[PDB]
Every structure is written in C-alpha cells, then in structure tokens.
Amino acid sequence: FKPPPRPDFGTSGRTIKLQANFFEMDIPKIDIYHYELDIKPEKCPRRVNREIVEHMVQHFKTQIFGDRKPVFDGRKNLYTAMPLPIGRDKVELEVTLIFKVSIKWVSCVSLQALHDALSGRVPFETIQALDVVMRHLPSMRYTPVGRSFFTASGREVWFGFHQSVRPSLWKMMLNIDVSATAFYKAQPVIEFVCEVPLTDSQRVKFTKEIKGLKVEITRKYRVCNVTRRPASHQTFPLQQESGQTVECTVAQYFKDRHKLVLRYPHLPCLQVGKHTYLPLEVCNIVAGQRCIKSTAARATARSAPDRQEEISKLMRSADFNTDPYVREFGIMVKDEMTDVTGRVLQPPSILYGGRNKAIATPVQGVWDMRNKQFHTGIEIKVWAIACFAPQRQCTEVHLKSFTEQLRKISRDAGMPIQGQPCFCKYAQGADSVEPMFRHLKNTYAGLQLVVVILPGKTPVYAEVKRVGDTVLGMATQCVQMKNVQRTTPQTLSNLCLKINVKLGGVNNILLPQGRPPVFQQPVIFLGADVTHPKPSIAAVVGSMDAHPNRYCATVRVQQHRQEIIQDLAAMVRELLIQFYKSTRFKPTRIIFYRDGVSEGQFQQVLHHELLAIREACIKLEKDYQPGITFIVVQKRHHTRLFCTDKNERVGKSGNIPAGTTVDTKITHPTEFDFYLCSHAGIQGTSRPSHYHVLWDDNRFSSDELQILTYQLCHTYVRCTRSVSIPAPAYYAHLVAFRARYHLHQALAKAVQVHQDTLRTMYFA
RNA sequence: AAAAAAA
C-alpha cells in the first residue's frame, strides 16, 4: 500500500562534487488562501480563463482585490497571499464584452506543514499551490506545454524551458531545465500541403499529417478528416430560403456567400468539426501546438557544461526573486545551483569465456571484446544467408568477403562459425519472403540462424520478424546493405554479441566472486514497460539464469493508453513458472523493475501491480510467499548533474562518470529513492536514471540496491557497455517494441511467440 | 535493421 521509509544513505564508492538544476526556495511560514473559480461557460481552454482572471483582477481592484495580486491555476483555482473579503461566499461577476465568474473561499493552506513535512510528521495541495505561484507569470508570457514553457523564437523547433516545484530533504527546491520541442509551423495549409489532383497515395499521407490539428480561416477548427473529393465536387446539405435541403458543392458555396472563387479547386477539402467542409486555400494551421510525433539533432544536445551554462543563463533571465507574484508570497529562489556530493560505484568485473576466460574491467562504462571470447559460445554448424538487395547493387564478392570476415571474427569471438552458409541467395519482395522462409528449415535439420540482409527503409523487416519468431521458430538476424559493403571489426563484433545469445549462448557474466548477498539465495529479476501508439503493448521479462544473463519475455496487449498491466498476474506467473523449469529452484525474491510510471500513477500502479505479482505467486503454491521489490525506474525526468571540477568531466560531453549515485539533497525526503547514472555520456547532457522503490520486503540497504542496479546495467548483451536502465527493464522495452512490428483474439495471437523462440531471447 | 548514447 504505502512506500517504505528510507533505510539509510549508505557509504559505497568514491565521492564527487556535483551540481544540480535544483534551486533552493526560501519558503515563508505564512498561510495561503485558496479560492474555487467556476466560470461560465466552463468550455474555455487553459489560456482564456487566465485572461478572464487577468481582466477581472484589474476591473474589480476597488471592489474585492485591492493591494493583493492573485496567482491563477488556469482552471478553477486562485491562491492569494492574505485573505479576501470574498471569504464565506459569494460574488458573481461579469467580464463585459459575457462570462459569469464565481469566487468561493475554500480552505487555508498552511506552509509550515511543508516546513514540517520535510523534517518528520507530504501535503500535495501545498506543493500544488507553490507550483501555481511560480507557474503563473511565465504562463502569461510564454505558451505553456505541460510543465515546460516555450516561445516562438512541416515542423519547426521552438526553444523554451521546463519548470517544476519539487520537494526534497529539509527544504523545497525549484527544478529548471532548457527544453526544445518540434512544433507545427504557422503555415497556410496550401503551403503545408506543399511542404509534405492528388493521387490516393499523394492524399493519404497528408491526412496523417494534419488530422487532429487546428486551422484558421482567411475561427478555431480542429481537423477530423481530409475529403476524397475536391472542392468542385464535394457536396454538403445546404438549406434554402424555401426550406428544402439541396446539395451544394463546397466550391460553389464560397462562390455565393463569400464572393470567393477558388484557384485550386482540384485539391481536396479539410473537414472540420460532421458536416462542415473547408477548402485548403483559406486555411492556416493554428500556431502554438506541440508536434504529435538531423537538423533537429544539431539544435538539441550540447556539452554538459554547455547546458549548465544555459540553465544559469535562464535563471538570470527569469530572475524569480524579482517576480511580482513570487514577491507577493515571499518565496526566494537562489540564483545558484545546488551543490550535491555524489558517489561513483565500482563496476563489477565481467567474466568472459573460452579457455583464456578473461576479466573485463569497465572504465567509463566501456570495455571491449579484445583478446576475449564468449562465456558460452554457440558454434553454428549451418545457417542460411538471404540478401534482399539485388546483385545489380550487391555481389557475391561482398558476401564472399562479408562472411570471410564474419567467420574470422566469430572464430575470435568464441562462437566459432565453423560451418559455411548452406546456400546464399538473392530474393526480393516482402511477400516472397514467407514462401522462401518456409522452405529453408525443412532442407536442413539442426538449422539455426538466417542472416537476412535488408536495404534501407522497408516493411519486410516487419514480416521477416512477424514470420520469424511467432510462427516457424527459426532465429533471425537482420543487417542493412550499408553494412555488407562496409565491415569494420566492430560492426560485425556487435553482431556476434546479439547472435550468440539469440542462439541460447552466454556472452558474459558478472564476476560471481564480487556479487551482492542477494545472490546467496535464488532470486528472479523482472522488467516491465508499456509502449503506446490502437492497443498499448505491455511486456514483462524475467531472469532465467543465476548469473544473471539469459532472460525470457512475455508480452501482452491491453487497453489503449492504459499504463496498468492487468495480465501481470498471468505474465509474472508464467515467467516465474519458466524459472523453475530452467533453474530447478523457486525464486526466494522477486526484484521488479517497472518503467514508465509517473508519481501521479504510483498509488495506482503499485496498488494493482503488486497485488498482481502477489496473485501470480499464490496461484503456484498456497504458501509460496517470496519477497517483492517494486522499483519504478525513470529516465524521462528533468534532474541534471554536472561536474564541479573540470578534472572529473568525462569526454567531449563533459558529463558525469558512470555509476554516479545521489541519495542526499535532491531526493525524496522521507521515502527511498536515488538517482543513478549507470552509463557514460557519449552525446549531449546525460540524464541520470532515477529509481523510486515503492515496495521492498527483502529489507534492502541503500548501498546493496544501488550496486545491484549498477551491476545489472552491465549485463546488457548487445554492447560492451553499461546502459541507461537495468537489463530487465531494458529488455522489456525491446519486447514491447518488438511486438509492435508483429502488426480480437488474433492480435494476442499475433503478439504470442513460438515455443522454441520463447526458450531464449529472440528480442535481443 | 551492429550498438550505445542524445529529444
């Protein structure tokens, strides 16, 4: 039900001086007064209600407000510094040239409760109020997008920033970060049509780009569909002065009431609202809407000291300590970043294979395959290469050499490719793949892999994967034609990493000598993530080794945009059933890693998902009562950590080193959480993964779980690196994403995977 | 779809 109290802060790893974009807030101890605001009509969006309050605050200065300046939620909440005569109800107010406004007093918001909640005794309404104060004035000036703000200097990038009030130990802080987002450019639709008579293929793409967007007339209409018929032919039921309803072409209607004759009658019409039709000549896309979905990569990113400068530049630009509404309440936001002292954990040694074994020691989150080979190499006796690019643009000599080098490296990689390709084909057409794909497994018993080669963007990868893992059960490895003409000793080396484990092999295992005490008993590791598009796809992956290296995946479909997992009881049980079949043991502890859950869903996710993970254990045996560790991981937060000393920055990114852990200062005051940069930053500013532990029966310490989380990120089997999140939560992302390429019993039947592929990691 | 990182 409720999260556990933080056990400790731990003492592991070397200390490092850092900075965070958390800015301390000097909060007064006065009370805040909340007022509900019911305005008619209630249909108006966020921005208009803020203008209504903005107009009535000046209008009724003598009547009700006076010296005070009120902050506005944007909907139905209004906080003030000191009380108003409005208290006890009631005032009904008009806004002149139509809105009737009602200001009703609610309750007093005591700020000391926060000053007390950070030192014993977490009132959401108080933190809800402090954000409204800081959010209010930037909402006036800039265009708000969720929590972030943006301004205006066929997509277009708008540079803005993010703002949020977050609680921390002993005090309150303000989180600010530079943010950029793609926005649909304020274009006339005719140029929006131009930038993306129309053919059915020419037309159907435009409908995908503009559906659900808002346009104006040369009113506010949200587009629903793009007509098949042009303006000169599309009709609508027009009534006449007589009363009878004749059919009228949309081109001729503008020719009568609006005196406008269309220049582009051959183009279709934007359907707005039903029964309304608008041609493309008179429509401009509404400015200020976030885009739903190379040049965008150059504007984004920058060194970590570069981003650290922009946040401080922006902190100078806003100057929150001189914000008239922040002045009214007395809040003071420090102009300096918060100094935090993190800890860099030791990376676990990694045992490789072959008779020469070896011990890879990761430095800056990287090691190499050099003078090493696989812990459990899989010698491939036979396989079938199937290139899908023509010998007009490819040649046997490529594949004669591509396999020549590939065989040479797998010889060094520990999975010796001793056989030779049973056949080597050229085949084109996504449809003819399946008939060929059927004929290859029958010709060769003990067959393993099929190296299909795919040139550029193509939906054949969807069918090669759909027919590959769900039906017949053969292994499948894809590679672009761009990588068969050019073979560097690493492009092929990362391939042998994926292929070996996809054939049941073990590329590497953590040093068992140096391992936390949670491995003294049998323990299973789970990862879950939901990817939304109609149906949301949920995947749950479970540990199968005690190393732990090999995993197994279960993926289901569920309600559109649903973040909870109802089939968690079914999937965890099925996952944990496969654990006994492979390990011969029952896992004493379940370590659940959950991804994609915001704190607004913590009480909703933990309640159901922990009960489902307990329903899974109880269906096995009446007394199978292991310990559940519920860990929500977060990568889409906004916390940033920068190095105080230039002698600790790593690479051109200037980012923090791998294994940087933070328990103090900027974490949740009472509960148990921490930020952990398991990886090293190659590009831009690193975003350290945050782990909030909602349930823990296993009685973990802060150290042991932080080291366990760090060690699991090394166990990724697709690169010689540490990664963003632990491998279970990472593998869950692949599986739910792999099910997307599998295109209502048939959907679950399409997402269901074959038995022989379910044996190991088809997804890696 | 060699891979990680970056929105």
User: For residue A615, how many other CB atoms are within 10 A of its CB?
Assistant: 14
In order, the DSSP letters of A317-331 are HH-GGG-HHHHHHT-
Distance CA A607, CA A2 (A): 9
- Domain end, chosen from A228, A259, A290, is at A290
Beta bridge mates, A39: A101
Which nt is closest to the CA of A455, judged by C1'?
A: B1
**Strands of A214-217's sheet in order across:** A276-279, A268-272, A221-230, A214-217, A283-285
Distance CA A613, CA A609 (A): 6
The residue that minimises its CA distance to C1' of B7 is A300
By the 8 A CB rule, do A677 and A660 touch?
A: yes
Strand A91-94 with A100-110, pairing: antiparallel
Distance A460 CA to B5 C1' (A): 28
Distance CA A325, CA A70 (A): 7
Tally of domains within chain A: 4
Which nt is closest to the CA of A453, judged by C1'?
A: B1
Distance A482 CA to B2 C1' (A): 11
**Cβ-7 Å neighbors of strand B:** A 179-181, 297, 300-301, 454, 456-458, 461-462, 465, 476-480, 482-483, 490-491, 494-495, 497-498, 635-636, 679, 681-687, 716, 718-719, 721, 723-725
Convert A588-620 into a string of H (helix), E (strand) and C (coil). CEEEEEEECCCHHHHHHHHHHHHHHHHHHHHHH
Distance CA A552, CA A735 (A): 10
For residue A435, the one-letter residue type is: P
Question: Which two three-digit tokens encode residue A225?
Answer: 């569909």
Same domain flag for A192 and A142:
no
Same domain flag for A762 and A674:
yes
Same domain flag for A684 and A707:
yes
Distance A197 CA to B2 C1' (A): 44
Distance A529 CA to B4 C1' (A): 20
Beta bridge mates, A418: none
Owner of token pair 């300590």: A321
Same domain flag for A325 and A352:
no
Same domain flag for A697 and A761:
yes
By the 8 A CB rule, do A338 and A19 touch?
A: yes
Q: What is the phi/psi pair of residue A709, to 5°? A: -65, -40
Strand A523-531 with A589-595, pairing: parallel
Question: Which two three-digit tokens encode residue A460?
Answer: 């054949």
Which nt is closest to the CA of A640, judged by C1'?
A: B6
On the question of a cis peptide bond just before residue A138, with omega within 30 degrees of 0, the verdict is no
Which nt is closest to the CA of A722, judged by C1'?
A: B4
Which nt is closest to the CA of A682, judged by C1'?
A: B5
Looking at A517-638, list the stretches that DSSP marks H as alpha helix, in order from N- to C-terminal side: 568-583, 602-620
User: For residue A546, how many other CB atoms are within 10 A of its CB?
Assistant: 18
The residue that minimises its CA distance to C1' of B5 is A682
Distance CA A396, CA A670 (A): 65
- Domain end, chosen from A513, A540, A564, is at A513
Which nt is closest to the CA of A296, judged by C1'?
A: B7
On the question of a cis peptide bond just before residue A3, with omega within 30 degrees of 0, the verdict is no
Which nt is closest to the CA of A502, judged by C1'?
A: B2
Q: Please name the helix (run of DSSP H) or strand (run of DSSP E) that holds residue A436, with its range, or none.
A: helix A433-443
Distances (CA, A) of A187 to A282, A460, A509: 11, 35, 55
Same domain flag for A391 and A338:
no
| Cα A315 to chain centroid, rounded | 27
Q: Domain containing A362 — which CATH number?
A: 3.40.50.2300
Distance A515 CA to B2 C1' (A): 30
Which nt is closest to the CA of A493, judged by C1'?
A: B2
Distance CA A658, CA A725 (A): 12
Convert A390-431 into a string of H (helix), E (strand) and C (coil). CCCCCCHHHHHHHHHHHHHHHHHHCCCCCCCCCCEEECCCCC
User: For residue A590, how many other CB atoms are within 10 A of its CB?
Assistant: 26
| Cα A518 to chain centroid, rounded | 30
Find and list the nucleotides of strand B having atoms within 7 Å of a protein beta carbon.
1-7
Same domain flag for A502 and A524:
no
Which nt is closest to the CA of A724, judged by C1'?
A: B5
- Which technique was the structure solved with, according to the deposited record? X-ray
Distance A290 CA to B7 C1' (A): 13
Question: Would you call A524 helix, strand, or coil by DSSP?
Answer: strand
- Would the annotation count A319 as a binding residue? no
By the 8 A CB rule, do A424 and A385 touch?
A: yes
Q: Domain containing A732 — which CATH number?
A: 3.30.420.10
Distance A50 CA to B1 C1' (A): 49
- Would the annotation count A529 as a binding residue? yes
Distance A687 CA to B5 C1' (A): 10
Distance A539 CA to B4 C1' (A): 22
By the 8 A CB rule, do A204 and A196 touch?
A: no
What burial letters (b/e) apply to A648-662, b meaning 16+ CB within 10 Å? Answer: bbbeebbbbbbbbbb
Same domain flag for A658 and A756:
yes
Question: Which two three-digit tokens encode residue A541?
Answer: 């992956």
Distance CA A522, CA A747 (A): 35
Same domain flag for A86 and A156:
yes
User: For residue A575, how many other CB atoms are within 10 A of its CB?
Assistant: 23
Looking at A153-263, list the stretches that DSSP marks H as alpha helix, in order from N- to C-terminal side: 189-195, 200-210, 250-256
By the 8 A CB rule, do A372 and A352 touch?
A: yes
By the 8 A CB rule, do A109 and A36 touch?
A: no
Same domain flag for A41 and A27:
yes
Distance CA A499, CA A378 (A): 9
Distance A696 CA to B3 C1' (A): 34
Distance A691 CA to B5 C1' (A): 20
By the 8 A CB rule, do A409 and A401 touch?
A: no
| Cα A79 to chain centroid, rounded | 33
Q: Domain containing A194 — which CATH number?
A: 2.170.260.10
Same domain flag for A304 and A360:
no
Owner of token pair 């939901």: A530
Same domain flag for A325 and A356:
no
By the 8 A CB rule, do A463 and A438 touch?
A: no
| Cα A613 to chain centroid, rounded | 24
- Domain end, chosen from A468, A483, A513, is at A513
Distance A689 CA to B7 C1' (A): 16
Instruction: For residue A278, give its domain range.
Output: 185-290
Distance A527 CA to B1 C1' (A): 24
Distance CA A359, CA A353 (A): 9
- Would the annotation count A595 as a binding residue? yes
Distance CA A695, CA A632 (A): 10
**Strands of A424-426's sheet in order across:** A424-426, A383-387, A449-454, A475-480
Which nt is closest to the CA of A478, judged by C1'?
A: B1
Distance A173 CA to B7 C1' (A): 25
- Beta strands in A659-744, from DSSP E residues, in sequence order: 660-662, 673-677, 689-696
Which nt is closest to the CA of A465, judged by C1'?
A: B1
